[PDB]
Symmetry: C3
Subunit: 289 residues, 3 copies
Amino acid sequence: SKKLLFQFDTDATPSVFDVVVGYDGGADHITGYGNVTPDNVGAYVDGTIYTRGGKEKQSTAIFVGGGDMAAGERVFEAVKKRFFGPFRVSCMLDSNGSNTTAAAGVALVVKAAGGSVKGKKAVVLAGTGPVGMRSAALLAGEGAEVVLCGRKLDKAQAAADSVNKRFKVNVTAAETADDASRAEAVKGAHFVFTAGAIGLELLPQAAWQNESSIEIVADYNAQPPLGIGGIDATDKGKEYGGKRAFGALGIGGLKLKLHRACIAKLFESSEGVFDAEEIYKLAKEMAVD
Amino acid sequence: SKKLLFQFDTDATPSVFDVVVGYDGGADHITGYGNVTPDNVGAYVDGTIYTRGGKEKQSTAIFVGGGDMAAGERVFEAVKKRFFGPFRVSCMLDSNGSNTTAAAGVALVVKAAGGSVKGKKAVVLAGTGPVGMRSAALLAGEGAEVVLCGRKLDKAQAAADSVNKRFKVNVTAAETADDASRAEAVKGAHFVFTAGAIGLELLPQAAWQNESSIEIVADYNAQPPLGIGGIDATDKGKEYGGKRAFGALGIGGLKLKLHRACIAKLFESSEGVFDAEEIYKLAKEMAVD
Amino acid sequence: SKKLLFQFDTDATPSVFDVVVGYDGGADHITGYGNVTPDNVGAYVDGTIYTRGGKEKQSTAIFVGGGDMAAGERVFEAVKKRFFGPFRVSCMLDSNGSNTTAAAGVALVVKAAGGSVKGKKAVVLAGTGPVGMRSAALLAGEGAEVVLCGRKLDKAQAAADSVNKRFKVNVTAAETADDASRAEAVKGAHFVFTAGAIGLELLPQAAWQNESSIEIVADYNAQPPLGIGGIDATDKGKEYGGKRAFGALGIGGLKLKLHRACIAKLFESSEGVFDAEEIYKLAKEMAVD
Ligand SMILES: NC(=O)c1ccc[n+]([C@@H]2O[C@H](COP(=O)([O-])OP(=O)(O)OC[C@H]3O[C@@H](n4cnc5c(N)ncnc54)[C@H](OP(=O)(O)O)[C@@H]3O)[C@@H](O)[C@H]2O)c1
Ligand SMILES: NC(=O)c1ccc[n+]([C@@H]2O[C@H](COP(=O)([O-])OP(=O)(O)OC[C@H]3O[C@@H](n4cnc5c(N)ncnc54)[C@H](OP(=O)(O)O)[C@@H]3O)[C@@H](O)[C@H]2O)c1
Ligand SMILES: NC(=O)c1ccc[n+]([C@@H]2O[C@H](COP(=O)([O-])OP(=O)(O)OC[C@H]3O[C@@H](n4cnc5c(N)ncnc54)[C@H](OP(=O)(O)O)[C@@H]3O)[C@@H](O)[C@H]2O)c1
Ligand SMILES: [Li+]
Ligand SMILES: [Li+]
Ligand SMILES: [Li+]
Ligand SMILES: [Li+]
Ligand SMILES: [Li+]
Ligand SMILES: [Li+]
């Protein structure tokens, strides 16, 4: 049986990125939909549960994506709600790379910190997109005190409240409208993550290298100019004085390996669910080696 | 040459169901379009008739689908109108499973009735969707007196009039707004089909098991609660007193085999046309074995 | 690695034609987008440059199409603008077959004319679509005096001005509102190309066969009635008195071979750019044999 991946994207069109990685991860064919909503996804899922039986069921799987974390969560829940009994296929959520990237980045930082970040302070700059929101979630699950920042308080609050409802944690929000406010927000922090939109600097060199409390910084933006000044994108725990840095390509290598591995697993059973909990567990295992 | 199926769906997006079955039926690649109309389909068909020659022509084919039977018919006619001379590929119409499901269900019921339903009365409840409309068509072609019912008279009339124009038959329409009216409509019938939308009961157990005239009931809805009360979805002629029942999975197994077989045939010549007439002929042959 | 072609079409949906030829030309999978614009294409390109490394980069490529030449040019420039350093894949522009068809047709006519059309007069009737616009461009690059005609002066001027800006040439525009005006426009011409929309005659037999200056005529329309009266679609330099004619199928055979060859080349490196200049160079080489 051909391994068929159905890609349900909440954006207007399906992500190109997710298509390439789906093929490299083991799908035989990818069929993508945009504009997916909780209401229209049920009929799509029906197509995955009424077309194959027995051993063949596991050769169809579902991937949910898009650029709005909360919307992706709602579509993913609607997918799971449509299943019943043995009428199900494996499914994965990874809006904008949120789960796979955050899992890779947080796993790498936690490992570099010695295996625990409990009680330490983490600041996620521009944390209101999918990647920042999943980063905040995973850091809070590791027991860090997390501040999720954005240019406008209410959008940062909505992101933090979404994280707190989905993960039963207590991330706090802060408004950092400009460079000076972002530089103030990292003072006293132990860990800083930059999850800004592509091709933007959020944290200049002088805003982190002189802050004694900061132990590790991590940047997800791969397109120059990098999210963090004073680092290289390939950094993977590189030392800068007494601090360490992870750049977007250092994180991205693990994110890609993890994403590809999850795709393959979608076709190994008809019962898999790949979201933050499972993807982060796998990321920590992969970071060990 | 790769076997390329072009899926032209009248709905906003192409059916997932039809993608899976197309791959399992023998397509190498499926490319799907939504929002297809009689006006925009011609340029799509041009892409199928000007790109390959000779032996390679039969390796491209067209599948038309969607949720509106009349719209599917009009797109399918526009496909056939665009062809000329040897500039053609094989084509299939199966909006919402209408042809393949109705052919399977009617073939199974006709066989169970001894090979003829001529002169007997058939009632199609919720018969205004594609499946009910093709069921009514095939029953009328077998010489049954058919009543096509829906909640509102005018929509039922439009469905019956569409059937009668396409098939040159004389199906009649009836309004059955609620349970009590549906129960009245089956009185005196020999055959009852339920073609309601997914996950709805249309005919409770008490509304058919005490009607002496009813010989066979058939339900297309596979999602609980089933369209007919008092039966199991896997029933395939199971006896209930002096009556027999076909459930959605009993019908669906044949529908799937038939749909897959038609896909394979699309690539065996560049001249095939698969609609009710051909699909029902094949269904009756397949039901024999 | 699977050879993945990403098809970015400026029309509402991706061209079926371009899908078939992409598969026959060597793509393993084609994923198509409509409604592509210079603003939304960057994120699509990101998916092609951040997902594969090293030897695998060349196994992803981009194809830009659609029915508006100027729009295709702008999307293609936005694709190239998104690349940086080694972060790139091969790309091709062929809106509506413009480059591959014009290259085939012009290469065949130039060859039949003895290898040069410098200083001669070429008229492109209905030259405002992608095919006519690229034909005018290539003829002007060969040193012909080109008049690009359409039913309305301003649309013809916009097409000529687009050609002149992209190719640094000096095509002129003319209004030919009807048959009589088109017949007047070809008087004194040496070469006449008909690039009208499908299924339309633009140049009746009597409008070219009695014009002593005309040496070669070429018609791109394959659907009867042909763009030029008095010729056959398979003509490939067939003599009519002292003149020669190329019909749409004579041109189309080379266009198809050329288009397929370009697709294969997209996967031979991650640095290829296939637009008028490169495609015409290849067409002239292919026409030699
Ligand atoms: N390395 C990897 O493996 C990998 C994987 C996936 C994604 N990425 C990258 O990770 C980053 C985050 O991804 P994402 O999907 O969460 O991003 P996103 O949704 O595109 O943007 C994240 C946030 O950036 C902020 N922002 C936008 N424009 C800004 C500006 N001009 N100044 C300051 N802040 C601005 C916004 O927050 P506010 O409006 O609240 O201020 C926005 O919510 C992106 O660069 C993405 O490419 C990397
Ligand atoms: N077993 C198989 O092989 C197979 C294959 C294909 C499809 N199916 C199933 O067959 C059934 C019919 O398919 P279809 O495409 O024709 O269905 P559909 O178009 O989705 O719905 C059929 C009709 O159901 C009626 N309906 C909708 N909501 C209703 C309600 N609340 N109460 C009463 N009637 C209601 C409507 O008729 P009115 O508005 O006129 O009342 C509608 O036209 C579906 O359940 C589908 O999943 C089964
Ligand atoms: N043989 C091959 O290899 C090949 C390859 C690709 C395309 N084709 C064919 O080449 C032709 C040109 O392609 P294209 O994409 O450039 O075409 P197009 O954009 O669809 O149409 C070209 C022009 O035709 C004119 N036109 C439209 N309706 C007309 C009418 N009723 N009377 C007179 N003129 C009319 C319009 O010009 P104005 O509005 O300015 O008058 C329009 O811009 C088409 O027939 C296409 O199918 C052939
Ligand atoms: Li607020
Ligand atoms: Li900053
Ligand atoms: Li009426
Ligand atoms: Li009822
Ligand atoms: Li003008
Ligand atoms: Li004319």
